[PDB]
Short mmCIF file of C-alpha atoms in Angstrom, two decimals:
data_model
loop_
_atom_site.label_atom_id
_atom_site.label_comp_id
_atom_site.label_asym_id
_atom_site.label_seq_id
_atom_site.Cartn_x
_atom_site.Cartn_y
_atom_site.Cartn_z
CA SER A 1 259.92 81.13 26.04
CA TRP A 2 262.24 82.64 28.66
CA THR A 3 265.81 81.89 29.72
CA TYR A 4 265.76 81.44 33.49
CA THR A 5 269.36 82.31 34.42
CA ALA A 6 270.76 79.65 36.76
CA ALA A 7 272.51 82.35 38.78
CA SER A 8 269.12 83.48 40.06
CA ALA A 9 268.58 79.87 41.16
CA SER A 10 270.06 77.98 44.10
CA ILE A 11 273.42 76.42 43.24
CA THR A 12 273.67 73.58 45.77
CA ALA A 13 277.00 71.76 46.01
CA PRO A 14 278.56 70.16 44.18
CA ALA A 15 276.70 72.58 41.89
CA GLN A 16 278.68 75.72 41.06
CA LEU A 17 277.46 78.86 39.32
CA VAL A 18 280.07 80.04 36.82
CA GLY A 19 279.42 82.65 34.15
CA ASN A 20 275.69 82.63 34.82
CA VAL A 21 275.69 78.87 34.23
CA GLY A 22 274.87 76.48 37.06
CA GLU A 23 276.87 73.35 36.36
CA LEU A 24 276.16 70.29 38.49
CA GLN A 25 278.90 67.78 39.27
CA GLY A 26 277.83 64.37 40.53
CA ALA A 27 274.85 63.41 42.67
CA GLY A 28 274.06 65.77 45.54
CA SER A 29 273.83 68.85 43.32
CA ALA A 30 270.59 70.78 42.93
CA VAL A 31 270.11 73.81 40.68
CA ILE A 32 266.73 74.98 41.94
CA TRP A 33 264.96 77.74 40.03
CA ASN A 34 262.50 79.98 41.89
CA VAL A 35 259.83 81.52 39.65
CA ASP A 36 256.12 82.32 39.57
CA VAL A 37 253.87 80.92 36.83
CA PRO A 38 252.55 83.84 34.70
CA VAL A 39 249.22 82.43 33.47
CA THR A 40 247.25 79.19 33.27
CA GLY A 41 248.61 77.25 30.31
CA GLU A 42 250.63 74.22 29.22
CA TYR A 43 254.29 75.17 29.50
CA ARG A 44 256.75 72.73 27.98
CA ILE A 45 259.98 72.30 29.95
CA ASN A 46 263.11 72.82 27.87
CA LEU A 47 266.39 72.33 29.72
CA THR A 48 269.51 73.78 28.15
CA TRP A 49 272.64 71.81 29.03
CA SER A 50 276.00 70.70 27.61
CA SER A 51 277.59 67.51 28.93
CA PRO A 52 279.75 65.85 26.22
CA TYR A 53 279.86 62.29 27.58
CA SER A 54 277.21 59.74 26.57
CA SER A 55 274.36 59.29 29.05
CA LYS A 56 273.88 60.13 32.73
CA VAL A 57 271.10 59.33 35.21
CA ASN A 58 269.66 62.61 36.48
CA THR A 59 266.34 63.79 37.90
CA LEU A 60 264.93 66.99 36.42
CA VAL A 61 263.02 69.12 38.93
CA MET A 62 260.16 70.99 37.25
CA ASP A 63 256.75 72.18 38.48
CA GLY A 64 257.37 70.34 41.73
CA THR A 65 257.81 67.09 39.81
CA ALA A 66 260.68 64.62 39.96
CA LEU A 67 260.90 63.61 36.31
CA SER A 68 263.67 61.03 36.06
CA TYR A 69 265.49 60.79 32.73
CA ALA A 70 268.93 59.93 31.36
CA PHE A 71 270.82 62.96 30.05
CA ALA A 72 271.25 61.85 26.44
CA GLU A 73 274.75 62.38 25.01
CA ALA A 74 274.73 66.17 24.63
CA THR A 75 277.23 68.99 24.20
CA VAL A 76 275.68 71.68 22.03
CA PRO A 77 272.99 73.89 23.68
CA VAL A 78 270.38 71.10 23.74
CA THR A 79 266.93 71.95 25.09
CA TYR A 80 265.37 68.85 26.64
CA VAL A 81 261.72 69.32 25.67
CA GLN A 82 259.24 68.05 28.25
CA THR A 83 255.59 69.03 28.01
CA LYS A 84 254.11 69.80 31.41
CA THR A 85 250.78 71.54 31.93
CA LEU A 86 251.53 74.57 34.11
CA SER A 87 248.89 76.29 36.21
CA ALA A 88 248.55 79.83 37.54
CA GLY A 89 249.90 80.65 40.99
CA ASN A 90 253.29 79.41 42.17
CA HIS A 91 255.47 76.58 40.86
CA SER A 92 258.94 75.28 41.70
CA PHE A 93 261.52 74.60 38.99
CA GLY A 94 265.12 73.40 38.93
CA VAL A 95 267.46 70.46 38.45
CA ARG A 96 268.50 67.91 41.08
CA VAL A 97 271.12 65.16 41.10
CA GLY A 98 271.33 62.40 43.70
CA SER A 99 272.17 58.78 44.40
CA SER A 100 268.94 57.74 42.69
CA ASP A 101 269.76 60.08 39.82
CA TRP A 102 273.38 61.19 39.61
CA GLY A 103 274.82 63.52 37.00
CA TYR A 104 277.61 65.80 35.82
CA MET A 105 276.59 68.54 33.38
CA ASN A 106 276.09 72.25 32.88
CA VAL A 107 272.75 73.90 33.61
CA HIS A 108 272.68 76.92 31.31
CA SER A 109 269.10 78.01 31.99
CA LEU A 110 265.64 76.61 32.66
CA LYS A 111 263.72 77.52 29.50
CA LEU A 112 259.92 77.67 29.74
CA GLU A 113 257.98 77.81 26.47
CA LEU A 114 254.24 78.39 26.06
CA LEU A 115 253.05 75.07 24.70
CA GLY A 116 249.32 75.66 24.94
#
């Protein structure tokens, strides 16, 4: 498990990197993380965010996949666990918000744990 600092990612407006925390604000934002998969194994996607509201409609960008999900009422460093089999080579990670999946939260860091 590693904490992929959002500052090393691409803070696309309305996204804004503040204090090493990429916080998106409404559709159009995209906190894209650029990293290279270490080995060939199942890495479960854990997204750390804090948006004290109720439920938003965002699209999480991981391993080049557009996994749509509603940001469950969160506030405390909550790690959205999503099991995705990662392969060796190169993979794209991040968080995108758009008309199809709008949001308004803070993107602390893209955590990647070694599931299997």
